Paper text:
Prohibitins are a highly conserved family of proteins that have been implicated in a variety of functions including mitochondrial stress signalling and housekeeping, cell cycle progression, apoptosis, lifespan regulation and many others. The human prohibitins prohibitin 1 and prohibitin 2 have been proposed to act as scaffolds within the mitochondrial inner membrane, but their molecular organization has remained elusive. Here we determined the molecular organization of the human prohibitin complex within the mitochondrial inner membrane using an integrative structural biology approach combining quantitative western blotting, cryo-electron tomography, subtomogram averaging and molecular modelling. The proposed bell-shaped structure consists of 11 alternating prohibitin 1 and prohibitin 2 molecules.
Finally, we re-extracted the subtomograms at 2.5 Å pixel size for automated 3D refinement with implied C11 symmetry, resulting in a final cryo-EM map of the prohibitin assembly at 16.3 Å resolution (FSC, 0.143 criterion). The final cryo-EM map reveals a circular bell-shaped structure that is embedded into the lipid bilayer with a diameter of 190.2 Å directly above the lipid bilayer. The whole bell has a height of 84.0 Å measured from the lipid bilayer to the top of the particle and a narrowed top with a diameter of 89.0 Å. Notably, the map reveals a large empty cavity on top of the bilayer enclosed by the bell. As the structures of PHB1 and PHB2 have yet to be solved experimentally, we relied on AlphaFold2 to predict the structures of full length PHB1 and PHB2. Numerous possible arrangements were tested but we found that each of the 11 densities in the cryo-EM map can accommodate only one prohibitin molecule. The final molecular model comprises 11 monomeric PHB molecules forming a bell-shaped assembly. On the contrary, adjacent PHB C-termini interact more strongly and stabilize the centre of the bell top. Interestingly, these self-links only satisfied the distance constraint at the PHB1–PHB1 or PHB2–PHB2 (Fig. 4b(i,ii)) interfaces and were violated when mapped to the rest of the PHB heteromeric structure with alternating PHB1 and PHB2 subunits.
Numbering used by the authors:
A (entry chain B): 373 to 522
B (entry chain C): 627 to 789
C (entry chain A): 165 to 272
D (entry chain K): 3074 to 3127
Write the structure that this text describes.
Amino acid sequence: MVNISLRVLSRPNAQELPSMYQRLGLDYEERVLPSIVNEVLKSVVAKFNASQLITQRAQVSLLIRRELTERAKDFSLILDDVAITELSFSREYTAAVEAKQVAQQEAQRAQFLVEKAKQEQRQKIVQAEGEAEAAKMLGEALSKNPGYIK
Amino acid sequence: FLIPWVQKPIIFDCRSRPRNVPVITGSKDLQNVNITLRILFRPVASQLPRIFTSIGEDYDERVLPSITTEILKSVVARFDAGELITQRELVSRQVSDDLTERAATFGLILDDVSLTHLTFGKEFTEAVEAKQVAQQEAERARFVVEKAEQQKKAAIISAEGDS
Amino acid sequence: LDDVSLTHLTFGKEFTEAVEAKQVAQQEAERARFVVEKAEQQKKAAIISAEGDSKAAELIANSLATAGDGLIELRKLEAAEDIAYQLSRSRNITYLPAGQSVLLQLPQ
Amino acid sequence: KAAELIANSLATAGDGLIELRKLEAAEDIAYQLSRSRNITYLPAGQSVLLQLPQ
């Protein structure tokens, strides 16, 4: 079971108003929206697994948006935006957030270590190069006679 | 001197006035870019009769937004988002010349055209921040290189000195 | 029936014992699993380090090859300096003596 | 198992992989065998507080 709250912004199409009134009535928003939204949301959600809902949410929201738009259009409604808000379980949501927080932090730290390793490797090479050129320079400099080297 | 009911003077302001036109355009990368163009322009004094007859009193509102949006989108499409950050001056110039060319037809002269606030707003901070961090690290790397050179130099001089 | 749920499986004395016992045992399990996974972490770290050095060596060799023999030579010197430092890492600085406080009497 | 994994990783990573892991370990061991840290210095001393007449 997944609890999701969909937020939708909508406006009627100005040209179709007479059709709206005839078919739906003045009450167009209350009668049509909840029905269509529940139907589409259920239909879309059914396709995806719970794990996907968490990672994939942007994809699901767009999918619901497109489907809802198509359905809404027949109603002569225009939807400016459709977004899923609050996907959850009571206790499970909290646990879910905690789990995500922890995993994210560990992953980032892992990258810290890798990055630092890279940095040290680079430092080692640069210093080796530096010493090398320093040696070359020193040797060339010695041209100020052997007393120089001594 | 005017004849009171017969003629009516329409006074236009020749002064340069700033106009900001916000435009949302896509870059070549298909990234959304919000740019507000700042335009300072004024009417050409000799053309006023023509402008009034053709476009009208409100010609600033009618012509400006259209041409500006058209040109800006056309220009922006050419470059990618990364170029927009580095290359900003070039883009502004190109927008300026093309805009001036177009504006001239209508009898408007543009004093200056400049891209202002390449965004979004969240983007202002994120972009600057990201660049800042990169810059700091890069420069520190610079310090490292310089310091290494200095130490190498010191070593050479010391050896010479001992010599 | 809307819902049926067991509530308060007890009794009271044992209830406390039960929770306590659960906690301790679970902690023990926590420790065991944590230690093993951490061992894995160290395992990984060692492997990554080895591969890291590995790549570093490859890169250094490549860089020296480009930079030529002279490059190699003084890298060798740097390394020698490092080795020498590590072999003996210590030193001190000398100072001349400081003084202590005293009272000053001003003459009349 | 760590040894085993390393060996396998080296195999995938090729010869170059093994060589510098070897130098890494060598440096590690050399490091611990002789470890210590010293510091550079900045010379200094107190100054004097002198009152000037006005």
